[PDB]
Symmetry: C3
Subunit: 114 residues, 3 copies
Amino acid sequence: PMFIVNTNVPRASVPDGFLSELTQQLAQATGKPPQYIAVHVVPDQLMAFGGSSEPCALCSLHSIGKIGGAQNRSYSKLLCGLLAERLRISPDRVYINYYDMNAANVGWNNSTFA
Amino acid sequence: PMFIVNTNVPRASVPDGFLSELTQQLAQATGKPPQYIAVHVVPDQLMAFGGSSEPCALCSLHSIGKIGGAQNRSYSKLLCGLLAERLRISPDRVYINYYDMNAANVGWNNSTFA
Amino acid sequence: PMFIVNTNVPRASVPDGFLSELTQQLAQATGKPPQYIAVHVVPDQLMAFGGSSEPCALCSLHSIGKIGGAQNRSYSKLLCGLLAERLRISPDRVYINYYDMNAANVGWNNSTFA
Ligand SMILES: *C(=S)Nc1ccccc1
Ligand SMILES: *C(=S)Nc1ccccc1
Ligand SMILES: *C(=S)Nc1ccccc1
């Protein structure tokens, strides 16, 4: 799986260890090996949520399976919790788009996962 | 909707009020409350369109429904119009990817919209 | 088609000519005139792959059709090859998400491709 967070929170407000914590927590939540988890944090963005420039985030999670109603609710609780506790972003100012990728549509190591 | 614009136009050429204008115009265009709308503008990018580094944009619009042939043509006229007027980007150097998201695949406020 | 690369490799390590090379190589690979090809490279990113911040890349390729098992394997060999040669990123630290877009869901020039 891969997780991207885009936020208007400044770079200096992203704590040491944040990418490592995301990696560990995503491994735990998806049950997948941390070796293949990718994470990407993009601070200092020009963004608004509900017309307001208070702290917010727009995120994506891509996974080959492990995407669905109950799973995505669990991921949202986990990820909004992390964004609130580490970046001080209110959960009601976060969107996360979930993508269930077909293995044939994910490239890696000169080939695909199919 | 959530609207993201990535462009090689520099930050100083993005006019004051642009995020709010995008929010207002998308609210009016989708018939939705502005409290739902998220906007994200990413200037100063290293990009090319047709091999040329003249002003261009790569964009995404995500919505839970309200995505379809006629609706997407209307969004494109609106959004290319704003990019032309405000960022001086030719409409034939803009791509907008439209995504019809399922409510179960959009996280918000510790849960999803399902 | 549109190709986006997000990487932790620094801006100075992206060769002059890289966007033009990507455009030409993708034109040849997708069978499309280069006038339609968009490319976007995002260096200096805060990212990790497998918990490590060694060079890595997270990419996307969007196309109206011409996406599938064998085609995507060929794109992955091409694109991982270029990232390895030009940016010195190991192919096993690259993900490429492939998206088969419907023509009605791609805006361009005040309308869509439908
Ligand atoms: C998870 S091991 N990685 C992943 C899943 C889906 C798309 C890209 C990467
Ligand atoms: C477009 S109104 N944005 C949107 C719709 C539904 C849920 C969240 C955001
Ligand atoms: C290639 S003609 N351009 C393209 C394909 C898919 C989505 C956006 C742009």
